[PDB]
Design a protein around this nucleic acid. Structure first.
Length: 117
DNA sequence: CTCTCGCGAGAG
DNA sequence: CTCTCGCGAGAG
């Protein structure tokens, strides 16, 4: 939320808009790897996921924190940052963000499916 | 691996 | 009953 949280990290979203920006952990070198190879909001979303949540946090959680498996909830502020970074770099819509959330939940489901094996 | 379907439980 | 939502899983 404030840059003092992560010093060597970067900003998710628009740096010059204090209301639509989140400070996160990934280093400026990884943040250029993402904005270079991820040329669609769908690929950027799931690359940001791998780089913002340790995979065994992915294998134990989902977005809302509900469900029959009783998974934990992924950080609502981190998920907000992904929402700003996709809006800022791609100008996604409310329906576009809904599809993205479905992809994120499906990615975390496969991480859960793996963990059992 | 991602994408996306459809099932079935619970909220409304 | 309709809708929302988590889910397993197959296909690409």
């Amino acid at each position: 939320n404030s840059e003092e949280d992560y010093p060597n990290g970067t900003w998710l979203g628009d740096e010059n808009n204090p209301e639509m920006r989140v400070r996160c952990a990934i280093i400026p070198s990884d943040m250029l790897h993402i904005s270079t190879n991820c040329r669609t909001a769908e690929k950027m979303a799931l690359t940001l996921l791998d780089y913002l949540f340790h995979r065994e946090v992915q294998a134990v959680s989902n977005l809302s924190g509900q469900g029959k498996h009783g998974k934990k909830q992924l950080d609502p502020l981190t998920i907000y940052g992904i929402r700003c970074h996709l809006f800022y770099k791609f100008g996604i819509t409310e329906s576009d963000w809904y599809r993205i959330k479905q992809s994120i939940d499906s990615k975390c489901r496969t991480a859960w499916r793996r963990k059992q094996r």
